[PDB]
Design a protein around this nucleic acid. Structure first.
Ligand SMILES: O=C(O)CNC(=O)C(=O)O
Ligand SMILES: O=C(O)CNC(=O)C(=O)O
Ligand SMILES: [Mn+2]
Ligand SMILES: [Mn+2]
Lengths: 214, 210, 201, 214, 214, 203
DNA sequence: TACG
DNA sequence: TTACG
């Protein structure tokens, strides 16, 4: 159960023109604000009153209203414009406030295949009773990448969890860590553990297997 | 000019928590004050506001009857009283203020609020050992967030990927912190990972070797 | 001149008692500021034409109408808007909850500056009933609500209307008095007035 | 607000062996069930009591419990084993019931880039005030396929909605429809309308355009 | 045939109420568990409520407590889910399910659609997606109908190969919109004639529209 | 002396005081009792434990499990603490407490697999039960007999209580001081029986 | 409504 | 403070 949406994504390169739309069906006000958020920071007010620039916002930002549709436009994307953007629904005095789903403008780059590594469990963790097998997908593009765990060539699902880093500032890649967890008992009833990575950069999906304790 | 949120932290389902938001550098006078929240990896969810001049309040549906926003002109501080908290109330709670009744031009940095049955616990760090290159540290089974991972106390930064934590089915968090380095340096230079979990005051440095 | 909170009986005949009630600060100052800006931008203001002899003229004010039934004045018929702005619905409801009177119609006037006005009239339509209760909520610059009593076949009352003030007219006021908002000779900022009424089929 | 999630996805070929894991940590009971659902049909029960095969379920379905982890194993898939699989968590008498997130098992295929077609709005529709521009991505694999709208080379977002067909029985491909909607005024303010498609089987973005009035 | 039939579904304003019934045929609802489980479009199963029919003990999901009531009538072999103050997010297919266990649901009804919305029932507008240039692609845009569902056939049912009818989408206006497409050898454009047939039974509206090039 | 009807029974009044037992047939409805029997058989961590009598190490003719934060020693053997109560057992605990006014912090579970399983004559009079303990007994499965005999004074009254599926028995007052009880072996076939005895254990 |  | 059926 979740109260919000994950931000949607938009791929763009420096110099592109971007217009995000915010539908507000049957609204009757232009009291609309637009915000910007970068990872780990609080939002910043970009636009108030549908079209008014907040102080310190560059002039390449503009806000517009057509009918019940509101728009935020960046005329030519600068490198510091890659962030998540939010639209605040028409806010009537005395009434609640509603943020739309965020739009996350990530930067386009060349396809870049991941360097894949697999890590067996430490002996410390096995002593404790559990086994974590990590599979790392390092510095790749684009974001879409399917990791598939196999144990004695049985495809696993529901015993692994993954996490993705934010797009890297220097080289515009992503990284992914998937972690498969078993009991020590369950770990020792099998021999070969393999993560199979599927990505655009890769000809054919790669696999990084290992046999237990070698 | 700043807003400071405080009073967050850890409580169990059904428990109570009272967040505070202090204004410094300016004064909340005729301002509208809002509490917005953001769950990890998710979007902003406005939860409440007060018109400080009149005391009028508004609340989000997901939250009405359980939360109460208030302010003290006397102490230049706003408050969010959160009762009957449930797991999905877990988020970074932002305080924000408004010249307008809606346009939030100043925001605090946010307090984290975690709602779970789990009890404060430091992590166990396990090596991710380089093979026949990349290595790292598995920061496993801690609670609540956050956790800090540096490498070689700070000397090592280039090439490091510290991942967002994952919430395991046990209600405990697990992340991993990896580095890619030249294979040649494996035998030579030492790689220690430095793991701080301030909520339990656990500091752990683990050396990582093939 | 009447400018303090209170209930004032300004005449008692020929139709009956004419009573007006003044409540300054009914809407708090910051909310009144915010209401003024939002209604200035969100109300579908138009400058409409009246007809007095055989000629058509532009009214020296912007106007808008809300409610299921229409308002026809100066051969101007304001098409009824069913969709009330939420802020206007809230203000309607507050006036109703504290005063005990109900409304189904709202006229909105924007006096852009000192050159805008409304001329002498009474609110004595057949669609508004005989002893009509009318509520007036003001925002923006103070302007003067002037009243003059009709002679039988000259009594005057002045009511300054400031930011956030609620005025109620009831009793014989529309039968026995006329009112206007005059032009001014020094600069005025915009004023929004909300007049809530009951319109009948 | 969303009460549940959309099913996770596992890609497998016929005859592969699949073990879906359902985590129920801190649990102290083996009253666990497994269900299968196919598009448009109601779920049917497969495993009850963690490991007991339901009356008339194929024997290739297995279920077992190790510690607090429950597993549903298909020994080797067959064409009608591709469906969504839900784990009903440990059900304690007198307590609520909870279904886990579904796991959608889909057929693997060779990568197939999408066929891209763009449809300008009908004249019928514009004679009523709205312009709907459709872009079809036909018979592709895998499911992931981004679509970016451009209007006079301005990147759009927030003003379009898309939909994906279920996996086709025989060619094992997916198809996608995206609709960009504008007012007639907005639409007639601009000349070039394009849908730009990226996909695993596309080394570059494929763009399909039309100029208003041609 | 040990069937199970749901009644009482359909459309209601937010804040309104429905009473779902589940008629038990074939078998008996004597000493079993009756569950109500819902599924929002594209999402996983969400258990709503259950009753132990012998004692009348009931359990409810937190999302639903205080607003729904499950009950049983042994006399008529009929279960009931009274749903009050419905919110938009209660919109789902509601299933009725029975078990001899307290949790393992072996029998399922086919479920009725419950739509909680402020929109009013409305038949679709049908616009053509006229074929232009590419391998021949054409279709119909079934826009601005309410509520779900809608049926689309091609040429009264003869043309079915190459047909993709896409899942509908809920627009910001509250109305649904979908697309159906078919790919065609471009040589038939001159000869063969193509018509989409649209049934919207909630509006009792049937529309055939012919799709030709311009 | 045979008690098989719902009721409050003062089975003796001396020498220590009133011994009181209360019988509630059908405390758990029949279908729920069936389901509880299945779940507790399947889920409870049953073990056959070894006792020691006069240097003799014996397997108890029953499976047992313990719940509660405080250990439990009888017949010279110690059942270690299980603070994580099965949720069904916690629920049944709460129902018993609300419908009786008595509180509990300990649960002993006995599973009698068939007619050869049993428990021998004893009283539940540990010092860790306190003075005049209150004990609640909830039974599931096949009917078995709870036999009681009154302890004689320094130098015999008897009661048989059949315990059927879903029946709650309460013992309070002087019952453990003045009586012993057992569940005997039977000679005809028996299906499994689960008994839950809720008790208060002290530090 | 044309008046400041 | 279990070996019986
Ligand atoms: O503006 C005011 O205070 C009063 N307005 C009216 O009476 C009107 O427009 O008819
Ligand atoms: O099994 C029963 O009914 C009674 N059991 C006990 O009294 C016990 O184990 O100490
Ligand atoms: Mn008037
Ligand atoms: Mn005993």
């Amino acid at each position: 159960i979740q109260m919000t949406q994950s931000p949607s994504s938009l791929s763009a390169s420096v110099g592109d023109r971007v217009t995000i739309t915010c539908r507000a069906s049957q609204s009757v006000s232009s009291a609309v604000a637009w915000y910007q958020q970068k990872p780990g920071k609080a939002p910043k007010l970009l636009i108030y009153s549908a079209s008014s620039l907040y102080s310190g916002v560059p002039s390449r930002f503009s806000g517009s209203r057509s009918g019940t549709d509101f728009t935020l436009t960046i005329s030519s994307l600068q490198p510091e414009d890659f962030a998540t953007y939010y639209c605040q629904q028409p806010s009537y005095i005395y009434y609640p406030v509603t943020f739309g789903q965020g739009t996350k403008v990530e930067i386009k780059r060349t396809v870049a295949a991941p360097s894949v590594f697999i890590f067996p469990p430490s002996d410390s963790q096995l002593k404790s009773g559990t086994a974590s097998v990590v599979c790392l997908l390092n510095n790749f593009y684009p974001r879409e990448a399917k990791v598939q765990w196999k144990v004695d060539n049985a495809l696993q699902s529901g015993n692994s969890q993954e996490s993705v880093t934010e797009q890297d500032s220097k080289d515009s890649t992503y990284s992914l860590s998937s972690t498969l967890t078993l009991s020590k008992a369950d770990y020792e009833k099998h021999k070969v553990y393999a993560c199979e990575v599927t990505h655009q950069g890769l000809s054919s999906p790669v696999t990084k297997s290992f046999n237990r304790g070698e | 000019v700043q807003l400071v949120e405080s009073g967050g932290g850890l409580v169990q389902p059904g428990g109570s928590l009272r967040l505070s938001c202090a204004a410094s550098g300016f004064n909340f006078s005729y301002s509208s004050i809002h509490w917005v929240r953001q769950a990890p990896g998710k979007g902003l969810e406005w939860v409440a506001y007060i018109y400080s001049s009149s005391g009028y309040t508004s609340y989000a549906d997901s939250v009405k009857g359980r939360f109460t926003i208030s302010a003290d002109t006397s102490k230049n501080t706003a408050y969010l009283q959160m009762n009957s908290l449930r797991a999905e109330d877990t988020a970074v709670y932002y305080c924000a203020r408004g010249d307008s009744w809606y346009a939030m031009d100043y925001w605090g940095q946010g307090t984290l609020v975690t709602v779970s049955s789990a009890s404060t616990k430091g992590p166990s760090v396990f090596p991710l050992a380089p093979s026949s290159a990349a290595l790292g540290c598995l920061v496993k089974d801690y609670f609540p967030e956050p956790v800090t991972v540096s490498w070689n106390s700070g000397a090592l930064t280039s090439g490091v990927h510290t991942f967002p934590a994952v919430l395991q089915s046990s209600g405990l968090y697990s992340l991993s912190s990896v580095v890619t380095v030249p294979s040649s340096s494996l035998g030579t230079q030492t790689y220690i990972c430095n793991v701080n979990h301030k909520p339990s005051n656990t500091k752990v440095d683990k050396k990582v070797e093939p | 001149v009447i400018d303090r909170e209170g209930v004032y009986e300004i005449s008692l005949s020929p139709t009956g008692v004419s009573r007006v009630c003044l409540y300054p600060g009914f809407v708090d100052v910051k909310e009144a500021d915010w209401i003024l800006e939002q209604l200035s931008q969100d109300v579908p203001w138009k400058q409409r034409t009246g007809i007095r002899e055989d000629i058509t003229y532009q009214q020296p004010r912007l106007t808008a109408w809300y409610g299921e039934l229409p308002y026809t004045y100066s051969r101007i018929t304001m098409e009824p808007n069913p969709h009330w702005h939420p802020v206007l619905r809230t203000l309607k409801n507050r006036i109703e909850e504290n005063t005990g009177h109900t409304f189904n119609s709202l006229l909105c006037n924007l006096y852009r500056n000192e050159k805008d006005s409304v001329d002498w009239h009474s609110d004595d339509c057949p669609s508004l009933g005989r002893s009509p209760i009318i509520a007036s909520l003001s925002f923006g610059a103070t302007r003067t609500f002037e009243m003059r009593k009709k002679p039988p076949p000259v009594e005057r009352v002045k009511i300054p209307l400031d930011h956030g003030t609620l005025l109620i007219m009831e009793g014989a006021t529309q039968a026995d008095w006329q009112h206007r908002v005059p032009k001014e000779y020094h600069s005025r900022e915009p004023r929004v007035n909300l007049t809530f009424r009951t319109v009948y089929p």
